[model samples]
Target chain A: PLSGKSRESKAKQSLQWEKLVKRSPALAEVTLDAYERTILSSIVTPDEINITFQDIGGLDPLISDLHESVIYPLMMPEVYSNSPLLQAPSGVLLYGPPGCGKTMLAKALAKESGANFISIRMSSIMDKWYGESNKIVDAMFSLANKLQPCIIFIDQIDSFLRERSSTDHEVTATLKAEFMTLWDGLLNNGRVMIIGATNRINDIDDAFLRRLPKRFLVSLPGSDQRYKILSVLLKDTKLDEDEFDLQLIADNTKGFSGSDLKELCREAALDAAKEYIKQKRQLIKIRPLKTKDFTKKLRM
Target chain B: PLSGKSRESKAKQSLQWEKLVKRSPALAEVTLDAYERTILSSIVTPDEINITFQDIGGLDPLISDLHESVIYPLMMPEVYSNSPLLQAPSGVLLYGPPGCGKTMLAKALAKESGANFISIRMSSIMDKWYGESNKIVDAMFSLANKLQPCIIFIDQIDSFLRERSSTDHEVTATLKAEFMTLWDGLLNNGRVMIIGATNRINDIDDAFLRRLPKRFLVSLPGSDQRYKILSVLLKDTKLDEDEFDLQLIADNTKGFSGSDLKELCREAALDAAKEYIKQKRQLIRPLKTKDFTKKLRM
Candidate 1:
């Protein structure tokens, strides 16, 4: 009932018919090279790691040691040119408590080194539905190759790479065999870097541990690290120096990790503002943050 | 590959055709007669009411009142010969809570009244594919008429019969108008009883309400009704006087409705038996009155 002729001009109607007839030729092979190139140009590449030794906060020795050994050696091989110790690409493990910014460190390290950080769930390989998850595994490698010298961060590494249990089913057996094959063959590219992160590193197979030779335990950050993270977050907010003592806040947040400490700072700022608003007789204005507000959130 | 010739003997086939064609002038008339009879017989009559009523519980007051005032007069006109009353030949509105035995009561009542229940739903009336739904509705009513002395029960009826909210839209207006026309005159018969059950009574139009005077509210059962329902449910079960004190159980079970009471009893008996089996006990027994005290649930 709805027809184009009702509103269309005669010429325009004829043109639509002309286009329809044109489809009889080999129109399926029409070029999409321009469109493909246009999409490819939009990809952003990571550059220089600004997240330095001080930015890593309290665990100064560990961060500096890691920076000296793993990071800079890979990025700037020219510095240690004299020694026989040429930077052989090493895979690092970041294992720690949940929600403690293991991922943040990975991202920050990627930013510093200009590495193309590709995060993948190792569990995808063992998913029952993905009988052919190896295809995706191969695809990740190929993409990582194009974006050379990138960090392939696989989160929840234990789910797929855990030691075989007594009740390992047929699907698990096949999955383990396929993943082992992929892991053994992963050393083909020297430019690509793989970083494995997990909360339960013990559950990961002892045999798999041999494949990942260089592993580090990413523990909860010390108080100084927590302080540094808070300062970094506070830099972006409307906070001025000489308002709240950073050292006192750091001392108060004794056991907190970097992310927790940032959260604590944000909550304190919000609570202080809410107090200011609630206590106001008229349109009351508040000054910069006080130590009492920051210290109040650290009550265990 | 399975042809009729192989299924039936030549003599038997001819005899069947001979009987049908002999009664009718044309083969078309024979087919029509067969179709009409099949449709007519689909409606349930007054004879089958009792068996269907047993499936639903805790609607006895509403059911009794309806039976006395509305349904009894239609079935047995001689019962109220003195009172000059027309058979209240109108649509019946059965509104109630969800899963509170509204649909079951309608079917049970239809069976009791010995009327064929012409079941309809919003899906049956509205089709996104084309004019298929309207065509189906027409076919349903036509078939319903063939089964005379029938109750046409439209379950979840508000979806189709609710107020249009817009009289400007011709499709909406036409649907509403056509629906009332069908109920009022098109399929209207002295024998035809239209019963509508809905969870949303307020959404239904006032105009439609005027057509149905025999409206009913199917509220949840009270504490006393619930106790009675429990007694009726445990009547055939392994429950006995000394073993399980139903009076205390029912008193404890204040908030339970009919279905809830049944479920609680079944679960308690099964769960206690399961506990015994898990412990490798020698024997399992019927639940005691104390066994149900802690787990008195609605």
Candidate 2:
């Protein structure tokens, strides 16, 4: 008989599985055993992230490069099979400041290529016991190999593969060595691809950087890119057409990242919603989000 | 009765005490026993830093603000003693990008004010044992109080006092709370000032930021500031006047910081030295502008 806490946790897991199946029925139909489900819970399907390249507003050069390097080889393997010269890179590293679209680009790549996306967090794999960390690393690679054409997405890779020093813990050093070995094996075999992202490029180990040769700098958006991001973010929101000058907003938000633009739009919308509450309305009649709303918040 | 290792360590400690007495004989006469020596070793005397306000080139505005707020008040405590309103701020935050002179400014403050400098590292205070971390924090404040008119300089304050969330370690949470409580007590008492520096201000906790009201942004040097930094850094080094233009170098090094300018001068000197070695000459010549031009490529 299960304890009360155990039964409650089991019920919660069931509810999560139900929601997952409802969202992607195709994933539910896959022949994954119970043990596979438990260990590979972090593996997200292509359908789970329905975002396409179009969902991302800017980053034209990055998009084109991704298509040629990653998307084409994974999607249409037959064309690449005939040509010896045409091949995907060993790995791709997306590095920049925080709140940029590095993670978003990885998700879009997985969706476009129909590859199994195993988003791994470094903290989740750490073990207190000796040699257990290496075993976890081994299991991760094995699972990726089983789910062929997989993209093992490691976000904030610097934290996991930091520059090694003499004072580092034995576990961390061993774990890094095992991860690099497994990653190299997967790359040479040619079904699984590794995509790592980090905000601190300097913090990453030289060995990891050398292995992941193809690096793309996803910097803060320029003025034109900011306009496109702002338009997409405010697309669904009710706006006062005359009062809202998106070009002005974009011009002022020069150093903002994609996520910053999204936040600005949310603030602008909230400003409109606050008026309905102030007047004690029965239903929220959200006023048209204006340029003034964004400018005021930006000033503050 | 002492073991061989204990005797050797005791001999080394005696040598250290002799040197300390030579530097500050007054401190040696304080009658501190063996226990106090271990904890108070972190405190540095004014002799440790010979830097002054003049040594730091560029950052005139920051230097002036620091002088008015911290330096003048501390140096002239007699003038401010009569007026309650002339009390210096509880603390000052020096925030900027990496390789700037935040640490340099802190040392200069210690030297100028003739205050005892207690350089605190968070790693030294942390421990695996529970509640021991808070004990270290308490000891730090008590030591600072004993060494009155001291500056507790904490470099990289963000790493120690990061914003706490539910996922934070229990020890880290308690340490931060204890530190804040102790720091607030020091602030209210108004003798020992806490000077914290960080490259990332956003990572600091909101409560700490609120207490550290006097925050200054130490930005990258401008073109004129770069000129000043280059001139100061290259003052002692012999340069070929015709080939090297200080103005030209200054304009070109737009985004360089004070440390970067120092590095550039070092590179220029090394380039000259390498030529001397390659030529197999016995004596080294003064570095020339041509050397500076060649080193520019590096």
Candidate 3:
């Protein structure tokens, strides 16, 4: 009886396979027939991204806190195999101001935890088509089951799963409610994890906030965080810790976010790289970055 | 010619056309029998890049200088149509330190002047293949012919067309010399322009530099240059014209290059964004002097 259906299935055809097949027929096998394809544009194949816990600097405490709530389950699930109280939340929200490395932490958690992941953007899932929006929501969970150890990440998540608004016509309201229904139903398994990140956490729908049982504040870097971030950024360039102290750079960058401090580090290295390129044909330790160099790049 | 010959040409099959043809068969027409591909990956289409002279913040003098040597030939060639002395050279080199906007000027000169352009990078053109490298060079000129009024640009060009050293093993020498020969042959028409850019000028081959008859130095910024670069960077953000003075910000950044000043502007914006995150304001206030003043003072 099954052979009749199996033989008929072999009669099925292909779509979007010419380019994929040309690259590696091996990579093509991972794509299921349903991969004839929209709700895609977001899957990352294993090892494609290189952000481990190591690459993300300036949040040692955030890493430790996330380790307990998140990474620990993936590493050793037996600890919470029985107790409901010990179980991870259905969703985790990383909320903060712009450029506090909220995005990087969300990324590091997925990669370091060995989870199969799909990412979301407001532009990717929102469609020009109407009622079909619910089908896209259907594929979100349906596809995740096929790859169970899964993490669904949405950056700037509020744009999609917003608080209800009078302006929202059916496509969003229908698409939006269907999405929460599937999310609310996900307590069915331990393998699935949802990550929601945003800069505008204040404007997020109260119901949406309530669903994200675990919320973490990704705040600005204080002196020690800045020092760690600066140390990572300056790892390659020649700088003396005694005279050309990084603490001074950290001290000067009072309100500087992680990325802002990283920029200063690169600008100072540009000055040094220029000096090095001129003399790279010759560097017995390649001149130490001068304390005076930072002054030239100073915003004050 | 004959019926048999016509049939033989029709019998030719396809390779790599499925994806491209699906997008636009019109675009597929440009893939001359040779474009089964590589020697490409650098060609930008018209208006794909949004950079124009407006986006290049500092250096009015640099823009004016480029306008004459590079842009003038395309704008109205009649100024040099008859005269022997006024015509532009076989090549033009914009040489300078890193991050002085040499690359952006090259881009602006191409887009602003409505010329078809192909760009070069050390990674894209240099190949793992040995002898096959020379064929890639051949395609560079042949492809340009398919679209004349062409501009061939090489950034950090010394890496490709270098002052030959003992280390250059034959592929580079062969690939390098043939490129110059085609460039040398281009003097046959005014439709082609060759633009070269680099930071390491002293190390560049003189014979290579000599081909580039016009040379310009893209040096570091001074007072007015810093002010203009900051003005361009600050245009989008909300800031008081007086207390959050752009001029004061510029004067303090003494040795900052055009890019260093750019990074400074972004840091300042992050400060403002952080402030607005608090009070959770929809309309953030002007970035005060303190916003920018967060720079390190060692």
Model 3 global lDDT (CA atoms, 0 to 1): 0.61
Off by over 4 Å in 2: A1-300, B1-37, B279-283, B286-290, B293-298
lDDT of each: 0.54, 0.66, 0.61
Kindly give the stretch of ten consecutive residues in candidate 2 chain A with the minimal lDDT sum.
A1-10
User: Can you tell me which runs of candidate 3 are displaced by over 4 Å?
Assistant: A1-300, B1-41, B185-190, B278-283, B296-298
Clashes of 2: 0
Q: Write down the TM-score for model 2.
A: 0.48
Rank list by lDDT: 2, 3, 1
Q: Estimated TM-score per prediction?
A: 0.42, 0.48, 0.49
Q: Write the per-residue lDDT of candidate 2 for residues A189-238, one digit (tens) a residue.
A: 35677788999999987656655655778889989989988887787678
Candidate 2 CAPRI-style tier:
incorrect
lDDT of 1 by residue, B41-98 (tens): 2233334334356655667888787787667766666666777675745778887654
Worst 10 residues of 3 chain A by lDDT: A1-10
- Per-residue CA lDDT of candidate 2, range B19-104, in tens? 55565556555554343343354455566566666777887889999888887776578888897888766778988864467766
